[PDB]
Amino acid sequence: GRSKKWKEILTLPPVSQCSELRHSIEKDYSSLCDKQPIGRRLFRQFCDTKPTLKRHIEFLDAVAEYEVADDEDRSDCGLSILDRFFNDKLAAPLPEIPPDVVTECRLGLKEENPSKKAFEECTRVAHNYLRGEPFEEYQESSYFSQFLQWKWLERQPVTKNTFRHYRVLGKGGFGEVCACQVRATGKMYACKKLQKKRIKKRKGEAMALNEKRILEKVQSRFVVSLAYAYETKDALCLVLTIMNGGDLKFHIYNLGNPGFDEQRAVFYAAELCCGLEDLQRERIVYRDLKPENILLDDRGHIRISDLGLATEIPEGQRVRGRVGTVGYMAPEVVNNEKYTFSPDWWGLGCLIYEMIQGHSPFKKYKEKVKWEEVDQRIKNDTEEYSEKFSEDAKSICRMLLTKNPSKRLGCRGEGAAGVKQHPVFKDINFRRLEANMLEPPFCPDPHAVYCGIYLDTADEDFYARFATGCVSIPWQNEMIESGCFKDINK
Amino acid sequence: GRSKKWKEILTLPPVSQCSELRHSIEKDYSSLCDKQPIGRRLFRQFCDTKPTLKRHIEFLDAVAEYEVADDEDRSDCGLSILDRFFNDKLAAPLPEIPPDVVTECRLGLKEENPSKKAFEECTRVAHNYLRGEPFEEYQESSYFSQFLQWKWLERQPVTKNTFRHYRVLGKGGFGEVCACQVRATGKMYACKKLQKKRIKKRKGEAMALNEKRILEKVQSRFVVSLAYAYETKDALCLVLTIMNGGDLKFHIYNLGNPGFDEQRAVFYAAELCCGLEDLQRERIVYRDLKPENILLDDRGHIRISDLGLATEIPEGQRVRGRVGTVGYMAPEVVNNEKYTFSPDWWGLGCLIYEMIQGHSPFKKYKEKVKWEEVDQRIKNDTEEYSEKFSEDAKSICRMLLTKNPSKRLGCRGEGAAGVKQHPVFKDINFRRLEANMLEPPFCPDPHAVYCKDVLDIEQFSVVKGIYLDTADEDFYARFATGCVSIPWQNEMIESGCFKDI
Ligand SMILES: Nc1ncnc2c1ncn2[C@@H]1O[C@H](COP(=O)(O)OP(N)(=O)O)[C@@H](O)[C@H]1O
Numbered sequence: 005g006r007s008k009k010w011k012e013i014l015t016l017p018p019v020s021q022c023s024e025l026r027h028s029i030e031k032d033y034s035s036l037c038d039k040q041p042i043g044r045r046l047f048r049q050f051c052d053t054k055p056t057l058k059r060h061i062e063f064l065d066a067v068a069e070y071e072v073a074d075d076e077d078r079s080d081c082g083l084s085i086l087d088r089f090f091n092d093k094l095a096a097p098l099p100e101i102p103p104d105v106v107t108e109c110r111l112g113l114k115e116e117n118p119s120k121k122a123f124e125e126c127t128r129v130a131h132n133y134l135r136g137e138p139f140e141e142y143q144e145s146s147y148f149s150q151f152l153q154w155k156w157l158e159r160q161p162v163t164k165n166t167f168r169h170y171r172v173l174g175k176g177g178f179g180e181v182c183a184c185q186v187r188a189t190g191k192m193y194a195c196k197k198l199q200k201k202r203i204k205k206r207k208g209e210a211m212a213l214n215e216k217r218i219l220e221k222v223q224s225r226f227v228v229s230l231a232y233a234y235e236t237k238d239a240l241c242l243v244l245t246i247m248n249g250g251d252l253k254f255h256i257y258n259l260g261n262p263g264f265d266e267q268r269a270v271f272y273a274a275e276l277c278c279g280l281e282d283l284q285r286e287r288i289v290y291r292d293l294k295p296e297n298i299l300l301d302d303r304g305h306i307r308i309s310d311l312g313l314a315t316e317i318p319e320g321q322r323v324r325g326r327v328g329t330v331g332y333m334a335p336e337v338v339n340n341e342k343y344t345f346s347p348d349w350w351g352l353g354c355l356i357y358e359m360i361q362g363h364s365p366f367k368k369y370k371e372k373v374k375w376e377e378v379d380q381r382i383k384n385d386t387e388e389y390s391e392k393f394s395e396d397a398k399s400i401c402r403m404l405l406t407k408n409p410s411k412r413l414g415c416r417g418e419g420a421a422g423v424k425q426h427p428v429f430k431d432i433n434f435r436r437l438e439a440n441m442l443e444p445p446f447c448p449d450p451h452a453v454y455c456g457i458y459l460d461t462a463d464e465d466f467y468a469r470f471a472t473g474c475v476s477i478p479w480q481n482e483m484i485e486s487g488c489f490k491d492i493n494k
Numbered sequence: 495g496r497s498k499k500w501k502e503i504l505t506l507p508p509v510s511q512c513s514e515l516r517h518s519i520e521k522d523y524s525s526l527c528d529k530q531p532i533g534r535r536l537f538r539q540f541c542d543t544k545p546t547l548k549r550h551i552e553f554l555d556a557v558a559e560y561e562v563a564d565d566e567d568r569s570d571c572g573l574s575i576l577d578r579f580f581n582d583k584l585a586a587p588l589p590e591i592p593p594d595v596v597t598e599c600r601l602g603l604k605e606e607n608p609s610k611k612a613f614e615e616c617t618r619v620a621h622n623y624l625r626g627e628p629f630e631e632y633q634e635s636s637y638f639s640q641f642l643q644w645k646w647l648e649r650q651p652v653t654k655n656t657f658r659h660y661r662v663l664g665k666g667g668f669g670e671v672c673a674c675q676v677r678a679t680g681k682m683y684a685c686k687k688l689q690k691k692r693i694k695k696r697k698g699e700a701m702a703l704n705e706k707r708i709l710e711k712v713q714s715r716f717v718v719s720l721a722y723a724y725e726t727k728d729a730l731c732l733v734l735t736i737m738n739g740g741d742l743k744f745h746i747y748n749l750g751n752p753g754f755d756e757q758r759a760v761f762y763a764a765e766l767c768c769g770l771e772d773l774q775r776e777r778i779v780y781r782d783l784k785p786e787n788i789l790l791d792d793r794g795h796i797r798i799s800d801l802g803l804a805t806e807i808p809e810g811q812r813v814r815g816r817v818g819t820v821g822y823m824a825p826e827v828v829n830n831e832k833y834t835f836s837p838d839w840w841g842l843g844c845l846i847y848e849m850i851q852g853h854s855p856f857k858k859y860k861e862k863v864k865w866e867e868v869d870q871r872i873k874n875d876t877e878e879y880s881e882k883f884s885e886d887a888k889s890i891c892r893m894l895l896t897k898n899p900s901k902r903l904g905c906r907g908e909g910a911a912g913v914k915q916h917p918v919f920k921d922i923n924f925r926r927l928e929a930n931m932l933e934p935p936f937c938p939d940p941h942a943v944y945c946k947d948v949l950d951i952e953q954f955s956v957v958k959g960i961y962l963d964t965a966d967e968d969f970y971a972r973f974a975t976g977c978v979s980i981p982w983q984n985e986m987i988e989s990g991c992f993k994d995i
């Protein structure tokens with residue numbers, strides 16, 4: 005757990021030392037009161053002291069509950085929100101909400117199929133009020149000062165000594181990945197060591213900078229999260245989300261028939277859908293969807309890992325290239341065409357197939373085939389199914405494995421939002437899944453195992469471009485989750 | 495210089511080929527109705543169809559004129575707004591603005607020297623209104639369907655055939671920089687050709703990928719803008735803002751005393767402040783501030799160029815390294831300490847000094863000094879001034895050339911806002927500078943020479959032992975091609991192509 009001197013490591017500075025930070029920090033309401041976890045907790049603590057503001061937060065928490073409610077419980081939530089916050093026989097808790105908006109809610113909640121978006125305008129108007137005088141007043145409170153103290157701690161130096169380095173978990177191209185624990189909080193992570201000599205030999209400079217950047221831009225429950233970055237004399241280290249449930253390749257082959265029950269594949273595909281949507285919201289194309297790249301956690305939840313090939317596509321632009329893994333590349337990828345997010349939707353089709361069948365759609369397990377031929381199979385050969393796949397599972401795979409990207413499921417403008425509407429995900433509540441409220445079908449088994457160069461000045465010019473050390477939101481979450489925020493804030 | 499068949503090149507698709515776009519476009523008001531120039535023009539066109547919506551636009555535009563108003567004109571400008579939008583109880587054009595917001599506005603406008611932010615809460619409420627039902631209604635309009643058509647044109651292929659290639663402008667480190675023109679619009683750009691063989695030999699893959707990204711991320715009148723990106727069998731090409739007026743090194747030395755008047759230098763330093771503010775709000779540290787890296791345009795406005803060394807710093811993180819040019823590196827840099835944006839404020843100090851004096855602060859012109867000794871001067875020696883400097887110029891240099899970054903001007907929690915507040919800038923109205931309403935003291939003369947030439951030929955270099963393999967293709971895959979949205983949309987409007995379609 006926590007170290008003996010944890011309170012000395014995580015000691016808040018005096019408020020006077022936070023003066024530079026106070027004036028320099030951009031006074032953005034969405035960031036400081038919502039997106040930054042400590043900021044959100046402290047603004048809510050401030051609201052708790054003002055009765056009118058406390059009701060606004062309760063209303064937002066009630067709307068969040070409604071948004072994640074089960075279909076047979078949604079109308080009860082909605083009616084409850086109306087009774088508690090818009091009781092006409094009582095005064096107005098939320099006066100700034102226009103009567104026409106209140107009225108529209110009452111009408112949308114009469115309908116037997118109520119829109120999970122029924123309170124969005126009420127929500128938007130509530131935040132408009134909060135980002136005004138309440139936000140101004142919060143900035144002049146003791147709670148904001150406390151937020152600035154945490155913000156100061158957050159920018160404190162990060163070195164190998166911030167962690168305890170345990171057993172090697174795996175071996176990569178640029179080095180090894182080992183299990184590490186933050187000394188101050190006891191939080192466990194995966195420390196991916198990228199050896200400087202290995203980066204130089206394999207020309208992985210642009211790659212390393214890219215992964216780093218991609219991992220910090222993405223804020224997803226289904227994508228491996230970067231919490232820290234540091235440098236040693238030998239390596240550039242990435243401190244990532246620990247996934248000790250093994251990769252999907254291990255579960256399909258080493259523990260599989262090969263393959264596993266449809267219900268699992270469907271659950272994993274649902275999560276992969278959300279991960280892809282999270283990446284696509286950031287205009288990122290993953291490029292290397294394969295079982296070996298999907299990892300499982302202790303709870304049985306998955307995350308996309310290996311973001312080396314992932315690339316951000318600016319608006320009004322396309323990428324090209326035959327990149328990825330032989331057998332997983334989309335027709336446009338093997339044809340070296342100009343494309344955007346289409347390869348990922350194809351990749352999902354490959355994954356669902358491999359999970360159910362027990363081999364990739366255009367390459368058998370172990371199969372000794374030249375790359376040159378696997379590419380022709382991707383371009384021309386069709387994929388044969390079995391009664392391992394339900395009629396719905398055969399449909400999502402057929403739609404995702406369509407050769408022409410413009411006719412492919414998820415590439416016709418509907419995006420992940422559309423892919424989610426497929427009849428395979430009938431039994432799945434995506435709002436609950438996206439909120440970590442759905443239990444996985446399977447859970448990994450505890451105890452059980454699941455798995456000449458000389459540095460010069462041009463290398464120094466590459467290390468200068470590498471920033472250290474902590475990642476803001478993941479760090480603030482670690483502070484809250486570990487109990488350190490509670491035991492210091494009190 | 496529009497194409498003959500320009501209307502054929504810029505043909506809008508039917509609103510069926512845009513059905514895809516309509517469902518995949520994130521409905522963000524700030525992006526679709528403000529940041530994106532064509533989205534902004536089309537939502538404003540939709541607003542003209544509704545008198546209440548038309549009034550909100552009139553108000554936002556009136557507040558925008560208030561903000562850029564000269565110090566004497568401002569009070570009467572403010573009063574006219576009050577007179578047009580808040581003086582009638584039964585005929586209120588903006589009813590959703592609470593009377594308490596209007597009360598605070600009238601208070602701060604009653605006094606002499608009113609805040610240029612007097613209508614900032616009024617503006618916030620007007621946008622909250624527009625971001626609601628008017629925005630939802632806009633999404634079902636014919637005006638929004640046109641936006642989807644323009645967005646489809648923007649995603650259309652870009653190659654070497656999109657441009658007319660003109661004269662070579664200069665010799666870059668990775669290839670030729672030449673004057674090029676978009677065929678369909680006739681707009682002139684500078685096409686930086688980065689040779690595939692030169693990038694390989696120099697190991698500039700990370701650098702090229704980073705430069706591209708930074709140029710698309712920054713939206714500044716004071717930073718060279720990337721408008722397009724395309725690929726050739728032998729090069730990666732960046733289509734950039736054409737800067738005919740030459741660089742600052744040429745103006746300081748070649749046609750300078752060495753140096754030029756304080757009045758010019760101060761205008762450049764003010765424009766540089768804006769550029770550095772723009773880079774910092776995108777969390778970027780430029781790192782290579784030096785005269786040759788600041789270019790002039792045909793009107794006499796400057797822009798920070800060569801964003802090769804520029805680094806984006808994630809929040810709560812720091813960079814290190816002794817990088818940049820010898821004589822221009824800050825103490826934290828020479829000592830290889832961990833830092834953020836401090837080297838850029840030191841850099842502004844080095845620039846102001848050189849422009850006024852005629853040589854860098856710790857190295858005389860063309861002096862043969864060992865880099866190690868140059869570093870020692872940067873760390874210990876204090877820069878000497880002359881009578882070429884007014885009292886306020888010496889003040890800005892001494893504060894920007896503070897050895898300890900924690901004591902340096904711009905680095906103490908005040909940023910660019912605090913630097914802009916320095917007495918040297920008393921004669922500059924920053925709101926007008928940022929809005930491009932200030933005329934520069936110096937304007938380049940056409941027919942006059944502003945750079946070293948450069949024969950209008952070649953591209954040729956040392957390419958022996960260089961072979962493009964699989965690893966190179968793995969890098970080209972990462973380089974996206976096409977246009978850069980905001981630059982592209984501005985170009986469509988400026989060229990009149992949007993107006994004539
Ligand atoms: N986040 C993580 N949690 C647990 N183990 C992890 C991990 N990230 C990587 N690993 C392990 O380290 C091995 C190598 O890391 P990897 O990312 O696959 O390197 P690579 N394929 O680019 O060469 C992985 O195959 C896996 O066994």
Ligand SMILES: Nc1ncnc2c1ncn2[C@@H]1O[C@H](COP(=O)(O)OP(N)(=O)O)[C@@H](O)[C@H]1O
Pocket residue numbers: 663664665666667668671684718734735736737738741789799800802945
């Ligand atoms: N945006 C631009 N507009 C007009 N001319 C430009 C330009 N960017 C570069 N040039 C010209 O090409 C020359 C070399 O470009 P440069 O920025 O130094 O490329 P680099 N850093 O790889 O050496 C400049 O000195 C200038 O003459």
